[PDB]
């Protein structure tokens, strides 16, 4: 859906996206290493 956001929130939403990409990245790397083993 669509909403217009304040300044404080968009920083919060920007970071939580940054966390998840890193979290997927760190989680995504671990699986092939054990898969390779």
């Amino acid at each position: 859906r669509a909403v217009v956001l304040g300044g404080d929130e968009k920083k919060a939403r920007s970071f939580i996206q940054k966390v998840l990409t890193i979290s997927k990245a760190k989680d995504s790397k671990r699986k092939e290493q054990k898969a390779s083993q």
């Binding site: 859906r1 669509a2 909403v3 217009v4 956001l5 968009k10 939403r13 996206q17």
Partner: peptide, 11 residues
């Protein structure tokens, strides 16, 4: 749910 969301009138 933030993924369900899309921002508008960005400022």
């Amino acid at each position: 749910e933030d993924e369900d969301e899309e921002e508008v009138l960005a400022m």
